[PDB]
Design a protein around this ligand. Structure first.
Ligand SMILES: O=C(O)Cc1ccc(O)cc1
Ligand SMILES: O=C(O)Cc1ccc(O)cc1
Ligand SMILES: [Co+2]
Ligand SMILES: [Co+2]
Lengths: 384, 384
């Protein structure tokens, strides 16, 4: 059931902006850990006296890292005279976000046909405005509305290189790292109440509930017309034996925010080999692999989709496999990206649903809760 | 002229603490860029609900990275009931330091015979107290006094593994990186007025002016009795054609602070080869190398100390060479470690003055200003 009810033309995920305390160290860590190239910059060397902003890219995936300078550098400026390249940036807002949440995503940006129209229709339909539409060098239009917590949904539209005022980075400083990551598949938010969050966001976007298929959480996925922009939202479930992971997120994040980014790889095995080689030399750590029970039980579930050799490669890399009625999903999760048990990353690859591949092919891993529990119980048995 | 006037027994440099917004990403970046091992941690997994602290080590060099958690995690605590492993840590002080200065050194820590006595004598002699002496698990004593700006001089003494409450880090997560860095040689502060800063610090430590040997700055070096603890201090000189680099520091740092850390390598050529291989894949960038004029003029100055082959290796690595009347100094400087043009790192190796090597053997590079200017002028000539 896809009603195609988008209230404005949405194209694709455009970028993810992290608000940092020091953008340089986060961007260099992410570049090496994920194999993303330094591609654009806006900072003191480009005339930006307000914020330091560094763009990493892998395929179509764009990660932006931004941190404020001393406000004293731009004290003479006013918004009309600003040297910031992102006019929605605010020293106070950024310092407050980072002190409240630690390292985290500030903007989920989507490209649309007309950012000014997307903003107006959204706000007309209940969206809480964050930054009004602003035209940059008569070329790009940027606008922001609240999504959940302190995360904004950012609309970008081009009349026709990232943003005006950004410079492509020098060749020597731009090493062509690539571990196979190609685009952002989905971006997941954690909220205290799922119902009102769903009603708010679906209310101003016209996004529809994506069709899917007792421990932890409840969730639902909002989707654009072609289901290429996908936004799952989680809420905690209280009363369980094990403390809900969503609740722990909310406590350590000081409220709602973005929980994880799901990054599509064109070759998840090569991606994971490359990231795992760097886990202890400045990259990212991964969640503990499931027990070999899980991989023993993979044969009857996905034996028609993956060969026994490709299954064994899943076992040594710790990859999880799930399947719906239209496709199969390979996935794995990192440990938290920063000091707090909050934001993390998922690497995925989808197989099936070719027309191009349709969005969400394979779902989002819903059946992995039951299969993992069954695996831990059967592994204990296999141990005793 | 070494009066040996230390007012308390000072041993060696013990560690450098960075105050960060996210300690995880800075520590992983530094570990890979400098080849330092993850060795100890104090964080949520060790019961610390206050700050995340990660220790990197290479030889005797200890880099500590600390960032605050949400204060809500420790809201029920009081100083007697604290779970912090560094009792001088304060949420407000840290957030204020980082928002004012960006990424930077908060503590220069020196090991002394008795931290409580060092604190008392210092304060008796004009030192501005920062954190009174605190005994940790009846094993280590920690105290802090103001050094310059918001940097503290930290005294540590052991009755007899970094600090109580820290845990050695798991073997898998601890990769034995080593590029040859072995200890901290000196730590340099930038201040607006050199005279009063010298008088304050020498006044409460009894440190003496280290004997050395028109553009930029004036400086002087304070030294402990055996001249193993070395603390140079710079002030800007105004009125020059080129804006003083010390003045730019003060503006972007919002005042006085630590300008650079000088790290001794046992093999500066191997250190620089290893760091330069990683400059564009998440490590550190280096200042532009001097012109080959400089290396052409190296023969007559240090031709008795380095061979023509060892000189050519200096040329391709960009190393600078200086010499006093007792030793020779190999040095090189990184670009700023973070977003701001503030803190950077120096890699050095000293040759000569063996008794063990005496401290400061070769000086601190004073003659490199004249030689670099002469080189740029002779290179322009060689160009025309
Ligand atoms: O997949 C989701 O919808 C989000 C999510 C996934 C795993 C998890 O443990 C918590 C939330
Ligand atoms: O060496 C010093 O005493 C500090 C310093 C060195 C080089 C420089 O450009 C500025 C300060
Ligand atoms: Co997911
Ligand atoms: Co120096």
């Amino acid at each position: 059931k896809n009603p195609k009810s988008d209230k404005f033309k949405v194209k694709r995920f455009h970028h993810i902006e992290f608000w940092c305390g020091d953008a340089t160290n986060v961007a260099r860590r992410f570049s090496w850990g994920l194999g993303m190239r330094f591609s654009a910059k806006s900072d003191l060397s480009t005339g930006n006296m307000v914020h330091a902003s560094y763009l990493l890219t892998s395929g179509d995936l764009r990660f932006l890292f931004t941190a404020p300078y001393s406000p004293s550098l731009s004290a003479g400026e006013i918004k009309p005279t600003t040297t910031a390249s992102i006019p929605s940036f605010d020293h106070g807002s950024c310092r407050s976000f980072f002190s409240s949440h630690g390292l985290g995503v500030r903007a989920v940006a989507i490209e649309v046909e007309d950012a000014e129209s997307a903003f107006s229709i959204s706000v007309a339909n209940g969206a809480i405005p964050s930054s009004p539409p602003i035209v940059l060098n008569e070329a790009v239009t940027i606008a922001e509305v609240k999504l959940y917590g302190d995360v904004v949904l950012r609309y970008v539209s081009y009349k026709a290189e990232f943003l005006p005022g950004f410079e492509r980075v020098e060749d020597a400083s731009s090493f062509p790292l690539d571990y196979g990551i190609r685009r952002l598949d989905h971006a997941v938010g954690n909220v205290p109440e799922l119902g009102p969050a769903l009603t708010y966001v679906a209310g101003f976007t016209g996004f529809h509930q994506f069709a899917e298929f007792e421990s932890g959480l409840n969730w639902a996925v909002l989707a654009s017309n072609d289901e290429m922009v996908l936004l799952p939202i989680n809420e905690p479930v209280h009363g369980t034996k094990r403390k809900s992971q969503i609740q722990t997120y909310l406590e350590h994040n000081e409220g709602a925010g973005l929980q994880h980014l799901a990054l599509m790889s064109e070759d998840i095995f090569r991606t994971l080999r490359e990231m795992r080689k760097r886990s202890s030399i400045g990259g990212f750590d991964f969640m503990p692999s499931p027990p070999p029970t899980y991989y023993q039980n993979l044969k009857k579930r996905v034996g028609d989709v993956l060969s026994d050799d490709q299954i064994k490669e899943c076992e040594e890399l710790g990859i999880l496999v799930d399947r719906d009625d239209q496709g199969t999903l390979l996935q794995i999760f990192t440990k938290p990206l920063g000091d707090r048990p909050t934001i993390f990353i998922e690497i995925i690859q989808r197989v099936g649903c070719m027309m191009y591949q349709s969005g969400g092919c394979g779902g989002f891993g819903k059946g992995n809760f039951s299969e993992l529990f069954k695996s831990i119980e059967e592994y204990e048995k296999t141990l005793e």
